[model samples]
Target: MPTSLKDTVKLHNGVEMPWFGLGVFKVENGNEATESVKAAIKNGYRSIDTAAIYKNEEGVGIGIKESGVAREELFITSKVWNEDQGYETTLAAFEKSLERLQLDYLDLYLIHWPGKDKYKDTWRALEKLYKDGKIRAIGVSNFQVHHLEELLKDAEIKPMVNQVEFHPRLTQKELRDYCKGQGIQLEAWSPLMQGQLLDNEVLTQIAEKHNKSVAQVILRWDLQHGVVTIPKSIKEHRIIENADIFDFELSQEDMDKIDALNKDERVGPNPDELLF
Candidate 1:
């Protein structure tokens, strides 16, 4: 449904997040980081996902400043790591992120994971930040249905987005439906399965039919499902390639083929099983 790089989806709190963005997972903080972020912004990307644990916020901040784009035109997001989830500690971690990113405020803030016993306590501080206008929206990453259900019982503000690992091999239908019913936007993190799906035959046929690469077809699939996707890349061509999904659309049959490939597989740690 996104027509261009600047297209956005409105969160429950009324903040508009871009349908496409660059994700800095293992990208280190240096020239590579600065150039990648700058390239994404130059190519019309308006959102950038970084985390405190990623250790690249300073480079991301540098890239944003060098892009010559107005700060308000971009949607910046960062997360508090599992170890930093608490009331006052979360507040300090936010400022630490802001300082590293060299930004006045964040467009969105997220808990990196729903670590046991502390995330619910952590949400209260995010609420305080949201109510104080320090953050425009607050959400969670890697949260399952039970985690969300439990968080809601004590939350003053509902989560606007629930980011999770999603790909052709791991489409989370039940959780997706649950979030939809509760007005929580679903976002895909490992949308590409870290390049594991590029050579897949089912995807190859679909890509051949569309004359796009496997990555392009998958990204397009992500959009058609109405799931917000952030595919990570550092190479200029790959960054551009990842954002080129807007030009073509996938047919329902191909979409179904991709959907049917789901086996609940994951490239990252399973949220439910990751106790650490």
Candidate 2:
């Protein structure tokens, strides 16, 4: 559905999110994060993703300020970590994240994980925040169909997005179909499988056929599959290279070929069975 990196998909609540964005997991706090955010923005990216556990919000805020891009022009998302997953605690945690990010409000907020307890409470806090206009959108990370069904049972608002580990190696077909049926947007983290698939023979073949890098092929696959992806890269060139995927469209047969690479694999923990 996305014709370019700047293209957006409207969520069930009518909020438009960039189909492509940058997702960070390991960029250090301070200058490293500061510059990464600035570089991405300077290169025409409008969305930036971070989390409390990343400990880089300060740098992110600094970068945003230096980038000279107006706050309204960016789509920033931060998640409440597992420990901060209660009603009062989530409210307080949201405040801390806001403080760290140096923003009065966030474009989107997400629950980092669906821990054993407090998920519903966390959702309640997010719902209240949404009602208060504190956050433009609310979502959950690593949530599956069961988690969403249970949340909707008592939720005043259903989650607008479900961010999960999605790549050719871990194509969550069932989860994708379920989110589609419920009008929930699906987002991908670790979309490149932590670079594990760059050397894969199948992807290499596809990349050669398309005359694009393996990364481009995977990103194109994501677009054709209707999944929003936030692949991480700290280097400026890699960041720009990652967005080069807008030019090509993967054919149906190649899409099916990429889908055939699925083997029920995951480079990250399973949402339902995570131990930590």
Candidate 3:
């Protein structure tokens, strides 16, 4: 259990990943991205998740430099887009992502999506990069169970993390169970369902019981269930408020209430159908 925002969960490969972080999914490049990253760092965020597809790496890099935090103290994550899935292109794409972020190496790098027929080759690139020390940890985002099984057959290194769209509406029990058994850390994106769950009667009732906002309740639930979450926010107050979930504990029944709300609904593209 995370007692504070700075707590970490050790990945299978012994890399320490923060339980909470800031995600820059739709943040604008330039000053907006720079300021949000700086604010998050200043307010105690040690992890910053970005991707080539997000197209804000330069600004994220600027924010990292201006955060006044040493490079070694932070954990940064980025992803390889679908268009660059082959071995050679993935390697080239990584260099560009590094160039844009202005970082010598990444803390964690992910294959953004698992389109059919190319992820195995992409994993080869990630494995080569890991062996060469370009990435501290490598993973995949939006990969479902079958994807993992298929990759495992040819993979030299088991993915240490699998990040997917998760929230009360999509609890992903089977995937969570599978990851737990396999030692793959499950991280949640859209953990609040992109504000879709804020007004949910069940969530509101629980929030009122704990004297926390609906968002806080959901984030707290994430922690209680041992799932890593990176909720995106460009505003400083929301960034701060999002991480303010450390002081509350939801009862087992409260947790079950949230669990029961899962309808397997998703706000993002389904992994099986969204192959690029």
Candidate 4:
């Protein structure tokens, strides 16, 4: 039987996306990113998230090829950068990412940021790409409810997912509720609280209860909440550890304790401030 972690969610647009994925952030250039991603594939990651800002899509593509995993079996995702935020430019950027990944179509493509520079135009570009069949699904990353509200007002297609900094320390209830109400998938980028949750007493106790690690406890919480998580790690042991979340389940009381761990803290950029 497939474990809960291997379960998938159907997007608002009717696409099925795997709940767990490996995020390739700050993995550096050349074979480093390629090797790390290949290791993830060997360790059982079916989804791989990359972006233009990561500047390692070529390595990711190489890793996928080297893994011997069929392209269609993987759920590959990439994003459009802030600088490339208009209809034509975004389309061009999408093509560049596709060329680098060597894939014909991305399983999911997202706007990297709300772009203090130009998000509306960027969204329009994404709209065009979705309509043109260049991508399987389109969404946004690092966007708050306010940003989402504005986009929904003018968007021809509702965003299928909203990727953000989510973990036990920052449960983001308001944003999570809004996304749930809007039929948008909530994708967690920093699902382990960027490693901050490893030392928490409560999480430690829970991990002991399940005979799992703190990382597994946190990831299992994310899975139970209907959130998609892309945890990153270069260490092979940690990579395998992160993927070993399928065997256990977090009880409802433990889930509430984890939920109470939220302090409204944010590890990523603030949404109100304009960033370029």
Candidate 5:
């Protein structure tokens, strides 16, 4: 049966973003990343997330071209790495990423990190990029409430979205609520929790009841919460599985069960100490 994978939400800045996309992190170089991206696009993913640090922008670009999808129909996102955090450097780095991706403009550009006490400068760079028409939208990744607070105080352009590590086991409600209050869209990076939630009894039981995989259940939770989720996978089956989320809907009781799994146990970095 054909699955429905098309779902979207409007960003705070009025940009329409796909709720499910392909994340190219850890997909490696050459054809591995290229093939995965191509397969994703073939499977109905219109958005593709890449980064300078991931070193797979070229592969993603090639895959996009190979997929024969029109540029306007695709929403491609890229991030400036931490080392490229300053204003001038970030601008240059963005250009480099653009060059590698072989694209005229990015759908969204983000600060890969808050960047070792230089996030404000990075935000300024993003602001300039947005004004210069270099990117369709701009935001930050891995930023917590405190980081958003600091950025909002100094930013001339408020972030349209804040991407963070979120999954069934780490709902990040505080940060999510804060982003909501500030009109910043919340995007989930690790919506499957890096495979940690695969064997979770609560999630498994719910999945069985819904006739879904744990991965699908988690991705559905992300959708129900209205967060943009980019679940990563190089495997063909898993890629298709991740895209199979829209077929089912979780009940309020199921959402509560998933919500009860949050333990504040993060699989990613400690944003407070790492954001510098």
Candidate 6:
């Protein structure tokens, strides 16, 4: 439904988030990080996803500053790591992220993962920060349905977004439906399966039919499903190619084809299994 990269979906809290973005997950710090962020913003990317664990906030901050884009015009996101998931630790971690990113405020900040027993305190900290206007939106990453239900029991403010591992191989239908019913926006972190699906025969045939790359088809599918997707790439051509999905529309048949590929797989750690 988004006609351009700049178009946004309004969160339950009424904040606008871009449906497409650039993710800097494994991208190294310094030039690689700086240049990728710059290229993304240069090519009309207004949203950039990073985290404290990514270890490139400094370069991201430099790139944002050098992009010549005003601070208010971009949707910058960072997250608190698992080790920092608590009331005081999360608050301290957020300030550190701001200092690292060289920004006074963040558009969105998330609890990186739902580790055992500390997320409630983390959500309270996020709520305080949201009330104080330090973060425009607060959310949790990699949280499953039970994680969300448990969070809701003691949360003062419902999370605006729930970002998770989503790709054709890992559809997350139950979690997606739950988030939708709760009025929480869902975002996809590994929409391409981290290059695992680029050569899939079904995807290749679909790509051939649409005259687009497998990556573009997948990202387009992400958009049509009403999920915000941030695909990570350091190469300039890849960055541009990824965002080019907005110009093409995928049909329902294509979406169904992609949906049928789900195997409940994941490239990242399972939220329930990861307790460290």
Instruction: Report the number of clashing residue pairs per model.
Output: 0, 0, 0, 0, 1, 0
**Which residue segments of model 6 deviate by more than 4 Å?**
none
TM-score for all models, in order of appearance: 0.99, 0.98, 0.99, 0.95, 0.96, 0.99
lDDT of each: 0.92, 0.91, 0.94, 0.88, 0.87, 0.93
Give a tens-digit lDDT track for model 2, residues 1-276: 676667999998999999989887888999999988899999988899999989998998999889998999899999999888889999999999999999989999999989676899999999999999999999999998888999999998989999999999889999999999999999999999999998999899999988899998998899889998898989999999998987778889899989999988888888788634
Note each model's CA RMSD in angstroms.
0.8, 1.0, 0.7, 1.6, 2.0, 0.7
lDDT of 6 by residue, 68-152 (tens): 9898989999999998888999999999999999999999999999989999999999999999999999999999999999999
Clashing residue pairs in candidate 4 (N, C-alpha, C atoms within 3 angstroms): none
Candidate 1 ranges beyond 4 A from true positions: none
Evaluation by lDDT, superior candidate among 3 and 4: 3
RMSD of 4: 1.6
Model 1 C-alpha lDDT per residue in residues 157-189, reported as the tens digit of each score: 999999899999999999999999999999999
Residue 65 displacement in candidate 1 (angstroms): 0.6
Instruction: Extract clashing residue pairs from model 3.
Output: none
Write down the lDDT that model 1 would get.
0.92
Give the higher-TM-score candidate: 2 or 6: 6
Error of 2 at 171 (Å): 0.3
